[PDB]
Amino acid sequence: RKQVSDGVAHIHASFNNTIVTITDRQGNALGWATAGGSGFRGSRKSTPFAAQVAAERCADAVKEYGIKNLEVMVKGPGPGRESTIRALNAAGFRITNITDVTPIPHXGCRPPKKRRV
Amino acid sequence: XXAXXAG
Amino acid sequence: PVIKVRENEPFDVALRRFKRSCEKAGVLAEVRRREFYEKPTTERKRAKASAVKRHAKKLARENARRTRLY
Amino acid sequence: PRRRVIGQRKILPDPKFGSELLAKFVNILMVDGKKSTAESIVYSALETLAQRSGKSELEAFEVALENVRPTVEVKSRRVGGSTYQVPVEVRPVRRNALAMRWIVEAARKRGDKSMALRLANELSDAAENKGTAVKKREDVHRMAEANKAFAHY
Amino acid sequence: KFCRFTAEGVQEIDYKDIATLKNYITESGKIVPSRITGTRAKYQRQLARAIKRARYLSLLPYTDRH
RNA sequence: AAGGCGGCCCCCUGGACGAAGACUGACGCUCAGGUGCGAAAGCGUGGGGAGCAAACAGGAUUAGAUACCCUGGUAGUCCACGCCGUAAACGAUGUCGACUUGGAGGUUGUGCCGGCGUGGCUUCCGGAGCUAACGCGUUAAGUCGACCGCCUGGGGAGUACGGCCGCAAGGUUAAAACUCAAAUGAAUUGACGGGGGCCCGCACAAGCGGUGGAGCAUGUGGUUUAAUUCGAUGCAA
RNA sequence: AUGUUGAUAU
Numbered sequence: 001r002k003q004v005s006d007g008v009a010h011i012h013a014s015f016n017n018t019i020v021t022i023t024d025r026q027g028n029a030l031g032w033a034t035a036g037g038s039g040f041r042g043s044r045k046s047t048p049f050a051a052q053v054a055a056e057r058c059a060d061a062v063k064e065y066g067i068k069n070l071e072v073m074v075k076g077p078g079p080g081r082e083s084t085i086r087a088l089n090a091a092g093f094r095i096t097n098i099t100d101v102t103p104i105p106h107x108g109c110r111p112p113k114k115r116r117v
Numbered sequence: 118x119x120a121x122x123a124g
Numbered sequence: 125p126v127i128k129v130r131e132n133e134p135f136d137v138a139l140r141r142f143k144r145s146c147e148k149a150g151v152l153a154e155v156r157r158r159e160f161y162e163k164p165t166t167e168r169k170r171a172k173a174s175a176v177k178r179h180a181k182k183l184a185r186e187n188a189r190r191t192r193l194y
Numbered sequence: 195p196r197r198r199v200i201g202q203r204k205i206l207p208d209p210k211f212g213s214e215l216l217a218k219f220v221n222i223l224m225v226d227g228k229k230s231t232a233e234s235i236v237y238s239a240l241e242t243l244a245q246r247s248g249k250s251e252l253e254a255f256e257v258a259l260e261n262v263r264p265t266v267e268v269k270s271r272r273v274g275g276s277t278y279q280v281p282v283e284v285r286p287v288r289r290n291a292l293a294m295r296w297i298v299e300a301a302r303k304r305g306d307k308s309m310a311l312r313l314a315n316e317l318s319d320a321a322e323n324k325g326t327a328v329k330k331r332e333d334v335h336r337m338a339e340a341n342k343a344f345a346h347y
Numbered sequence: 348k349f350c351r352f353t354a355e356g357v358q359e360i361d362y363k364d365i366a367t368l369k370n371y372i373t374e375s376g377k378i379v380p381s382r383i384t385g386t387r388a389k390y391q392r393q394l395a396r397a398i399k400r401a402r403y404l405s406l407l408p409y410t411d412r413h
Numbered sequence: 414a415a416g417g418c419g420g421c422c423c424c425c426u427g428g429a430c431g432a433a434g435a436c437u438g439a440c441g442c443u444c445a446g447g448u449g450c451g452a453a454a455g456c457g458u459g460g461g462g463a464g465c466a467a468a469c470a471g472g473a474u475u476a477g478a479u480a481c482c483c484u485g486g487u488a489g490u491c492c493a494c495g496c497c498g499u500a501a502a503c504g505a506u507g508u509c510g511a512c513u514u515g516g517a518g519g520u521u522g523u524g525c526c527g528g529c530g531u532g533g534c535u536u537c538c539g540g541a542g543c544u545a546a547c548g549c550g551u552u553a554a555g556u557c558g559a560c561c562g563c564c565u566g567g568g569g570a571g572u573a574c575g576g577c578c579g580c581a582a583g584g585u586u587a588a589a590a591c592u593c594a595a596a597u598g599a600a601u602u603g604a605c606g607g608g609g610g611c612c613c614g615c616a617c618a619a620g621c622g623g624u625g626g627a628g629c630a631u632g633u634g635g636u637u638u639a640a641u642u643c644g645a646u647g648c649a650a
Numbered sequence: 651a652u653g654u655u656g657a658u659a660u
């Protein structure tokens with residue numbers, strides 16, 4: 001609706017799933033897409049390809065706002081870290097920054113117990 | 118079991 | 125890690141420089157480490173084992189340099 | 195095989211048109227070593243196709259193959275019980291091999307009178323993208339695109 | 348490698364000397380290993396204490412993202 | 414000292430080490446009983462409770478699944494004070510002292526001028542010697558001395574009974590009958606592994622044609638018979 | 651992911 005030239009892409013690349021939210025620089029969400037939303041479930045959902053498609057659909061979601069340049073904020077260890085960023089570049093945008101914003105505690109809280117698979 | 122083997 | 129894409133830089137190059145920065149800071153390794161709790165005994169055992177590997181490498185590495193295979 | 199010292203065996207070209215592509219088609223059609231029988235069915239069928247198109251025999255055959263030839267296919271890799279159908283590019287030799295095999299398989303399950311007719315009709319449907327052979331090509335492409343995720347290992 | 352603090356013959360690393368301390372942190376703000384910088388163990392311990400004092404006084408950052 | 418101890422700052426405080434002397438003058442070593450400290454879990458009283466998580470619940474998986482996996486989740490994990498007194502509390506190696514070839518480090522003092530010494534603690538290798546062997550090897554499992562603790566086939570049993578301790582959980586001290594001809598350590602050759610590596614075979618894959626259904630031939634099993642002669646009967650009848 | 655068992659003596 002209201003035009004935003006300069007935006008921020010946030011990539012929540014978990015092991016199971018990739019969420020791409022494009023916000024403005026004040027962190028207000030304009031649109032989003034997920035690998036899970038984009039016709040991939042289970043094994044396929046957690047692929048770089050499913051994240052690629054999620055990124056494309058997120059670009060289409062924010063076509064109206066007229067975003068030109070993006071700062072990328074990458075989070076988490078997932079498959080869809082780099083494939084997401086390539087896709088946002090491939091879908092028009094000028095990538096100005098790339099920044100890892102993965103939370104790391106400086107010690108923090110005891111993680112869950114190891115899985116005995 | 119089998120009321121008591123290897124075949 | 126925090127890449128400014130500099131003026132007159134290909135994205136592909138800048139992305140490679142981001143991968144470098146993350147692998148240098150060791151973000152993914154840090155995440156995988158902290159995914160599950162490691163008991164202190166487990167932590168200590170792997171630290172010991174890693175040291176012994178590197179040592180038993182170093183000594184036996186020199187042995188390979190000396191002796192002929194053929 | 196393991197040692198993997200397998201070239202290509204010398205296929206003699208067909209007598210009529212001198213096409214090794216068509217010589218392979220006869221082989222794929224042939225049963226019980228009855229090559230003479232197979233050649234007659236093909237040449238009969240190509241004649242019929244050449245009339246209905248007015249394209250030439252080999253050229254009408256090429257249009258049939260062009261539509262039935264696959265580009266990608268899936269190969270099964272089992273990963274922890276579940277079966278990952280990984281898409282792979284088909285090599286040019288295998289493209290023709292699959293194209294021809296599908297056409298003959300399609301023709302054989304038709305309910306026309308002779309094989310030569312069944313074959314002519316299937317090549318005709320292939321050229322206009324209607325028959326079971328192009329449906330097979332579509333199905334193979336469908337699975338490949340469905341499993342495009344697993345291509346990028 | 349080689350240790351600058353042995354070379355100069357320093358007594359304390361000093362938390363106030365930010366120009367020096369900045370050489371022994373990463374871009375991320377993390378303290379660099381002695382195996383990388385070639386610092387002597389004794390000074391590495393002093394340097395860590397100095398960096399941690401500086402981080403408290405907000406002369407150095409804790410991390411790249413504040 | 415052991416258990417253990419990890420952001421930064423201050424306060425109180427213990428030990429170790431080194432260099433120069435000076436001082437006391439065998440004041441030492443060990444130590445049954447005794448006393449203290451002693452991970453985690455646990456217990457009591459009062460706090461706290463983010464994250465995690467016995468129990469528990471649900472979802473899966475499965476023949477079942479009172480599990481592993483998933484979603485939750487209470488005690489607990491945290492603090493104060495008190496209790497418990499045990500751990501593969503391990504170097505499975507008691508303490509103290511002396512002596513006996515080397516090499517490469519780490520760490521922390523120090524002397525002489527980057528080198529050359531000299532102390533402390535420590536990691537790895539290895540010589541003699543020792544050892545059943547594995548290995549240990551100046552930080553000994555070598556060579557000796559002092560004192561203490563402890564063992565005497567496997568099981569029954571670290572159990573019973575009694576005592577002591579404990580709020581309890583239990584701890585601690587600690588038998589017997591009975592039963593067996595073993596149980597055990599280290600190493601050796603194999604074999605095996607849902608261990609690793611490297612290879613091969615129509616072993617998979619890629620294909621083509623079959624078998625399993627039909628009728629018949631034929632063999633076998635079974636049943637039947639007076640007899641249905643005897644043998645072959647996973648692959649390899 | 652899971653994925654049990656193999657009568658006695660010789």
Ligand SMILES: [K+]
Pocket residue numbers: 118
């Ligand atoms: K049973």
Ligand SMILES: [Mg+2]
Pocket residue numbers: 112
């Ligand atoms: Mg989890």
Ligand SMILES: [Mg+2]
Pocket residue numbers: none
């Ligand atoms: Mg005593």
Ligand SMILES: [Mg+2]
Pocket residue numbers: none
């Ligand atoms: Mg406790």
Ligand SMILES: [Mg+2]
Pocket residue numbers: none
């Ligand atoms: Mg309590």
Ligand SMILES: [Mg+2]
Pocket residue numbers: none
């Ligand atoms: Mg309470």
Ligand SMILES: [Mg+2]
Pocket residue numbers: none
């Ligand atoms: Mg759980």
Ligand SMILES: [Mg+2]
Pocket residue numbers: none
């Ligand atoms: Mg004990």
Ligand SMILES: [Mg+2]
Pocket residue numbers: 503505
């Ligand atoms: Mg012991």
Ligand SMILES: [Mg+2]
Pocket residue numbers: 539550
């Ligand atoms: Mg040794």
Ligand SMILES: [Mg+2]
Pocket residue numbers: none
């Ligand atoms: Mg008892």
Ligand SMILES: [Mg+2]
Pocket residue numbers: none
């Ligand atoms: Mg008692």
Ligand SMILES: [Mg+2]
Pocket residue numbers: none
């Ligand atoms: Mg096969």
Ligand SMILES: [Mg+2]
Pocket residue numbers: none
């Ligand atoms: Mg049959």
Ligand SMILES: [Mg+2]
Pocket residue numbers: none
């Ligand atoms: Mg018989």
Ligand SMILES: [Mg+2]
Pocket residue numbers: none
């Ligand atoms: Mg006989």
